[PDB]
Design a protein around this ligand. Structure first.
Ligand SMILES: [Fe+3]
Ligand SMILES: [Fe+3]
Ligand SMILES: [Fe+3]
Ligand SMILES: [Fe+3]
Lengths: 225, 564, 564, 113
């Protein structure tokens, strides 16, 4: 047989699916592991039959188990499911979003203090700036990237972006499509404003003293046209 | 900029004032404080915060963290708050706001995210200390994966393996057996500490055991828990700063409960299965829990009190102790009264610890679920604690978490190293998804490394595909396990080079400050009272008021999560 | 005497001119030469050749082999020929004709079969070098058995375990984490090499990591792959003779592909997942593959291009990177163009290596099957290569085998030790049954010992009874694993006693000659071209001609061999 | 699924029970491990249905397998059986005394002097 360690895993998953099937046939509402194994075994079966595409299965398995076919809170506990199976074209990953239909019960439920919005970067002075991606390809810029050092494809008043970053949620990026024009909101960088790296236009404190040197380096390197 | 509350919570997890449901229980944890600066939160990923010269510093710093647990919701006796956790040199380096002071506001000075920092996203996760199971019968090495899979990182107790002595008692008796077990311990990821035979009316035999590496002694009735034994054992423990654990004289052969208490003479002692179904003076052993010097714990089978608790015991006692089928009952009248009271005593902070009694009248991977099932049961029966401030169960949560984290650590003299989420302590932490809190952990960190975690298909394109099951990680393997695991010993053994002498490669640390730990020393479970048992009705009384609870027909953190 | 051709082949395997079908593919390996003397072939068994004073010498010799692989069909970049392979002191001692010169003609002088020689029958088997997986995310120790079960003996990459940083990047960051992982490595049978975080615009933080044992650096976007970090990283790598691996700026934040190429400044760099689905400058990362200094590799999910490749990715990208369900597409137009081109580029020798991206958008035990599935797909599409001389696919075979054996070894500075079936190299070999070539190996030899193999019932009267599954052998256990496994480090670390200092018992060897490896240095994959991408159609072009392939509806080495 | 090592054990026990059920249906007299697994799987099934108490099951399972349903000596070899299962109120230990009806054959019998 030459059973690989991954094949040995799949036997257990498949057997768990078979036990879950038996319990559903008995009329029992399936729990979290039973529900996952029941859907996993279906995917593994269809893959072996090699008549359905990954695309077909991803669609077919949404709400494969209905809210009344599982215990309360099971649907919300499993927002997505992933199962690798061998298809005629090889092993492919079947990714299902909402495999089990949710209900009103939620384990690990978060109840907010207030529905009021969170004021991020509070008290920082906003700078409105028009930017144009004159490049042939779209690009994104992160929340903490030194805006002044962004891809030379971006056309904007760089002097006004010196020592500033995007006033967007931490970890988010702003997209500027090829040819697209946008109004960005910039705020001054926190801490000491010791900008080291990126495009190396600054590599030091973003003070007035470093500004002329930084603008000259930006012009020389093609960021300022 | 103004961010929608739902979007903030999805991205970074809950903030100040938000309430989190613990698993499928009716317990609500409220975020007491958030240590972040809104807009400066760390996020890992493509185009995110933790990047060269942005959230990640380019400036060298002596406090560059080895690991950062971003946007964690800490649940500990120290508080229920939101913070970034910084690990360095396998210890909790800092708790607060991590990042780069060069580009960010409000960064905790000793929480530098740099080139050498690894990232772990804790946004929307609950971070707790690793559990300490102070009632382990070292019967089977297979208990260790089961324990880790249930958030337990440290195990105190004793054994030799599947032999009658161990099967019954947490005892690794004598020098040779202690040396053998301490050397066997090298294999595992679990932190260990061994107890020797305390059942002796002779000094020499007790001293030999402490010097052999024992972290204390277990006095167990199977070797005769007589008043002479109790006194001799405590005398040696006092001399050597080690803990004593006790399973009292069930049959009241040499005396009643008061005779045992008298023999102890106000000296520090850890009272296992205080309720008495697991063993001890019938029917009044529970009365010991009211005493200041008595450090009491509970074993998993009697917590919570369910409709099947009594039925299960009236047979489970016969398989463990190997009793005649001629024996039918006494336990049928005695047991309901004390099992019920025990749950309320936990809620009152009278019983300070929860333990397992693993494969010897108790379950290895049940300490954590059963503690939260009891917390939930009481909340459901008695309602929100009067002690609570606001629409939350923070006080109850803190009372219950202390039972399996800090309080066992205080009892065994390891509170300076482990037991809680505090700066300076060893990084033995557990990451939980709130929907699975108390039932199924995500990641187990020991000594700053991931040692055990839930993991999907080994071949798979991502770590999520089925079957997702618990597996050993890098920190549990090779010579890295010697860097992440601790073998606790007595100060005498430690100071006399037990590590070198036994050729132990694991971290060897001494247990210290066992002798002067009273009820007053515990966290959220310092309650002392006059506990009495009616010798006719078997009802339990706390300062003259009937102490009881109703049996549960169903429990939380059970049926929704398990296949079998 | 005249022996019937069918009888010869049954007894000794194929000879000069015979063609072997590789698995269920349409690839035919032709025996280029046979090093035997007809009538003098070695056969092991009762009344056979290898016997005292006959095929086995009674004359002591300094070249008495420790192991003889009789009548092997070698498949390597060095050639596809028939020979006896001689192992001595865990190295390939000789290749040719083994035996006893006292009783036999045409014996290779340093290939003495004697009293101390063990026999392994290779008659009718294919012998290849152990695969090198240059893109490993050290996420789970369970990847190792999966890898070995697929003919992979060496793994280069990074990680701390299942932490977000590793789930996304092949980085073991900083001194403490590097030391911890190198010590964890002791556990395994797999040869390892760790990469530190290259994403730094500061020298000190990079230098610390090389000195801590890193074999190189990985520049990943999640940590910020800016031109500053590219330059600083390569500068330190050049100083310390270590390799650099790159996952480019997908979002084009600090520049376009040409800006990244300019930052590299013609310096040697290993460009991971060159196609771009695994990550990198959208939509033109693939254009880098034409450059002489760029050492390109492909990851498993995009090879071969199938009818389910695109569908699988448009979701696999969302689980790995943890993206919002609001995000639907861009990848639906960009991806077909580059995934298709990628297969063609492999057949042209433009992409030199195959890797995995294990549990981080790629499969651990798929490098070898997927390489041969692509070779087969292209043979079925484009036909027999014009480069072939005879009714065989030898040149194509040599081009493809180099992708996972010799070319990763050249890139990482380990080509002098491992990578091919050559005299003097370490005996890291894989024995294959032709019917299972590329899909299911028979025996895995590491450092001259069998470490892993397909094995039947442990109780059974012979090794063949069911269930036959992959199991660890003696070479993978005890202190013998320290004799058969290598932990690769930098020269600086090696020369400064990292082995002793970290107490590593494994073989510790330095990586050398990384900085001056260009495309010209590879074996059978030295092709440089002008690769372009239309920014509107996303079509890839090689020297102005569209580079494309058709998606496969079915692949070889799949459905016939696997249960699930 | 987050399968604990104890859940992986129970799958093997349950599958062994399913194989034993199949063999009994074929009319084969069950041996020592088959008999134990057959009774264990029944207990595991009833516990999941969550309609019976531990007390009920302990009583129900006495002589669950009859002397003619098993090989000779099997009953005597298994004087008691224990199986932990999850009930709606949590994991509880089901202890059965004489799960298999004994026959006059005794392997390892002690004959007094
Ligand atoms: Fe006890
Ligand atoms: Fe006990
Ligand atoms: Fe990548
Ligand atoms: Fe990768």
């Amino acid at each position: 047989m030459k059973l690989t360690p991954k094949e040995q895993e799949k036997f257990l998953l498949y057997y768990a699916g078979e036990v879950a099937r038996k319990r559903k046939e008995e009329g029992l509402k399936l729990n979290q592991p039973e529900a996952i194994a029941y859907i996993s075994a279906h995917i593994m079966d269809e893959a072996r039959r090699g008549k359905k595409t990954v695309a077909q299965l991803m669609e077919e398995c949404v709400h494969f188990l209905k809210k009344d076919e599982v215990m309360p809170g099971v649907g919300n506990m499993v927002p997505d499911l992933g199962v690798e199976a061998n298809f005629p074209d090889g092993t492919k990953l079947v990714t299902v979003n909402w495999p089990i239909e949710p209900d009103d019960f939620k384990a690990g439920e978060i109840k907010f203090a207030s529905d009021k919005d969170i004021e991020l970067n509070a008290g920082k002075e906003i700078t409105e700036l028009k930017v144009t991606n004159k490049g042939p390809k779209s690009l994104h810029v992160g929340s903490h990237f030194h805006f002044f050092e962004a891809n030379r494809a971006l056309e904007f008043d760089r002097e006004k972006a010196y020592g500033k970053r995007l006033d967007i949620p931490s970890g988010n990026t702003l997209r500027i499509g090829a040819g697209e024009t946008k109004t960005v909101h910039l705020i001054p960088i926190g801490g000491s404003k010791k900008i080291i790296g990126m495009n190396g236009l600054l590599n030091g404190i973003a003070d007035d003293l470093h500004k002329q040197k930084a603008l000259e380096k930006a012009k020389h390197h093609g960021f300022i046209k | 900029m103004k961010m929608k509350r739902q979007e903030y919570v999805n991205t970074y997890g809950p903030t100040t004032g938000d309430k989190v449901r613990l698993g499928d229980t009716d317990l609500w944890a409220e975020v007491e404080h958030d240590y972040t600066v809104y807009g400066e939160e760390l996020k890992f990923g493509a185009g995110k915060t933790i990047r060269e010269g942005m959230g990640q510093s380019n400036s060298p710093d002596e406090n560059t963290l080895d690991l950062v647990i971003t946007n964690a919701l800490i649940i500990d006796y120290t508080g229920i708050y939101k913070a970034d956790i910084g690990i360095k040199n396998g210890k909790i380096h800092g708790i607060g706001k991590a990042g780069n002071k060069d580009m960010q506001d409000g960064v905790t000075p000793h929480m530098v995210v740099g080139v050498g920092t690894e990232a772990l996203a804790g946004e929307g996760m609950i971070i707790t200390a690793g559990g300490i199971d102070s009632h382990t019968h070292f019967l089977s090495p297979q208990q260790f994966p089961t324990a880790l899979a249930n958030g337990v990182t440290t195990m105190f107790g004793g054994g030799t393996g599947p032999v009658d002595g161990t099967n019954a008692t947490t005892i690794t008796p004598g020098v040779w057996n202690l040396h053998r077990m301490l050397r066997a311990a090298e294999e595992y990821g679990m932190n260990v500490g061994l107890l020797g035979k305390g059942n002796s009316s002779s000094r020499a035999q007790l001293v030999e055991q402490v010097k052999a590496g024992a972290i204390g002694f277990k006095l167990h009735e199977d070797w005769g828990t007589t008043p002479s034994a109790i006194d001799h054992c405590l005398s040696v423990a006092d001399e050597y700063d080690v803990q004593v654990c006790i399973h009292t004289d069930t049959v009241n052969e040499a005396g009643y409960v008061d005779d045992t208490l008298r023999a102890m003479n106000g000296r520090a002692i850890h009272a296992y299965h205080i309720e008495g179904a697991g063993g001890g003076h019938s029917p009044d052993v529970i009365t010991m829990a009211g005493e200041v010097n008595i450090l009491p714990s509970s074993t998993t089978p009697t917590i919570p009190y369910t409709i099947n608790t009594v039925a299960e015991h009236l047979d489970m006692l016969m398989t463990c102790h190997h009793l005649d089928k001629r024996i039918r009952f006494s336990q049928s009248r005695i047991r309901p009264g004390s099992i019920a009271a025990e749950d309320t005593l936990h809620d009152m902070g009278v019983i300070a610890m929860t333990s397992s009694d693993s494969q010897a009248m108790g379950r290895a991977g049940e300490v954590i679920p059963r503690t939260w099932q009891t917390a939930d049961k009481n909340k459901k029966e008695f309602g929100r604690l009067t002690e609570e401030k606001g629409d939350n169960d923070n006080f109850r949560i803190k009372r219950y978490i202390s039972k399996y984290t800090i309080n066992p650590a205080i009892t065994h003299g390891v509170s300076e190293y482990i037991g809680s989420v505090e700066e300076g302590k060893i990084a033995d932490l557990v990451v939980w998804n709130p929907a699975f809190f108390g039932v199924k952990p995500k990641i187990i960190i020991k000594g700053g490394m991931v040692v055990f975690s839930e993991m999907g298909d080994s071949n798979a394109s991502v770590p999520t595909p089925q079957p997702v099951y618990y597996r050993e990680m890098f920190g549990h393997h090779g010579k890295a396990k010697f860097d992440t695991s601790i073998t606790f010993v007595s100060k005498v053994a430690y100071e006399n080079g037990i590590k070198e002498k036994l050729g132990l490669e694991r971290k060897v640390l001494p247990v210290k400050n066992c002798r002067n730990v009273t009820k007053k020393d515990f966290k959220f479970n310092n309650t002392t009272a006059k506990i009495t048992v009616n010798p006719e009705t078997f009802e339990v009384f706390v300062n003259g008021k009937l102490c009881t609870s109703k049996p549960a027909t169903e429990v939380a953190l059970a049926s929704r999560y398990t296949f079998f």
